[PDB]
Amino acid sequence: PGPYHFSEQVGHLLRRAYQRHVAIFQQTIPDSKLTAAQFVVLCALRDQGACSLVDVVKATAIDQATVRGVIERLKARKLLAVSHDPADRRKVLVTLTPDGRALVEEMVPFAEQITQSTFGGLNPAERVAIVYLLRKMSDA
Amino acid sequence: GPYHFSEQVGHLLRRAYQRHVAIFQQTIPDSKLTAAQFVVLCALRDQGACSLVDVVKATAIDQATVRGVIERLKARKLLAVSHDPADRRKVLVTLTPDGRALVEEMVPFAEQITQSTFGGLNPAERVAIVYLLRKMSDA
Ligand SMILES: O=C(O)c1ccc(O)nc1
Ligand SMILES: O=C(O)c1ccc(O)nc1
């Protein structure tokens, strides 16, 4: 088999690629204005309308705790709203604000630039392949 | 075009890396070793005596985090910190017998983890995923 080299394991490559992409995201959209987590939570609220914590988790693939923290940090900025479930008066329902939608629409071109710079020199087939495989790998 | 975060390469990278980290933690408990500690120990085993620059270049972890991991391991008597006699601003980290024993004990599980991370990819898809993740990091 040969010695074990972590440098050629799929996990090492995943970590390094994710770190590089996070550096690109932070260098293009300043971490001060919006984080990838906050940006994705707001985009989910925009795409699905009013969402509950379970909906935001299942759509955002972020654990309940980090989603709750992001929800607090964004509600403080009047970028999302917290209403009462029209079916469970003891549940939360998160909705998007005009300020939140305005921030999402302001940042979208930068996220597209981030996707393009992250791909780097990959040709179209290689881009489709990497997104296909990263999606296929994230399921049982 | 419309923006879907769900189909952007960053969301997919985050999801894949988080799933692989969950696998790594589900097979190798944090109590024994973290992925960072394991990778630094493997670097010490593969390269011998290393300085902070060598451990960084081999481990792909930022120098400050490498210092933190090295401290957390020297406290556990899994590596040793001897100062080079050819410099005073040079650190020299070496592997201990307990460190090499832990590395050799965990290597089969790290390989099992690499295998579990691959999931249902057929061999061609595996060649492709490692090819693309390596090609994308170089620009
Ligand atoms: O470089 C890393 O952090 C790494 C390397 C191998 C693995 O299985 N998981 C993580
Ligand atoms: O879900 C995330 O963290 C994410 C989503 C999109 C992007 O470009 N980068 C990171």
Numbering used by the authors:
A (entry chain A): 12 to 151
B (entry chain D): 13 to 151
Original authors' sentences:
BpsR is a member of the MarR family of bacterial transcriptional regulators. They are obligate homodimers and many are responsive to ligand binding. Recently, we and others have shown that BpsR controls the growth of B. bronchiseptica by repressing genes involved in nicotinic acid (NA) degradation.
6HNA-BpsR crystallized in the centered orthorhombic space group (C2221), with 6 chains in the asymmetric unit. The binding pockets are located at the dimer interface between helices α1, α2, α5 of one monomer and α1 of the opposing monomer, and are approximately 8 Å above the recognition helix of the HTH domain. The bound 6HNA is positioned between four amino acid residues extending from the α1 helix on both monomers. A comparison of the conformations of these residues shows that the side chain of Tyr15 shifts approximately 2 Å toward the 6HNA when compared to the unbound structure to H-bond with the 6-hydroxy group of the pyridine ring. A superimposition of the 6-HNA bound and apo BpsR structures reveals a conformational change within the dimer in which the wHtH motif of one monomer pivots away from the other resulting in a 7.3 Å increase in the distance between the α4 DNA recognition helices. This open conformation with an alteration to the inter-helical distance likely prevents them from inserting into consecutive DNA major grooves thus decreasing binding affinity.
